[PDB]
Specification:
toxin; CC-C-C framework; mainly alpha; about 15 residues; flat; alpha-conotoxin
């Protein structure tokens, strides 16, 4: 997860999500 708690981050989480 990591930064994926933030929807705006999760959408751009190429390495995390």
């Amino acid at each position: 997860g990591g930064c994926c708690s933030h929807p705006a981050c999760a959408a751009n989480n190429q390495d995390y999500c």
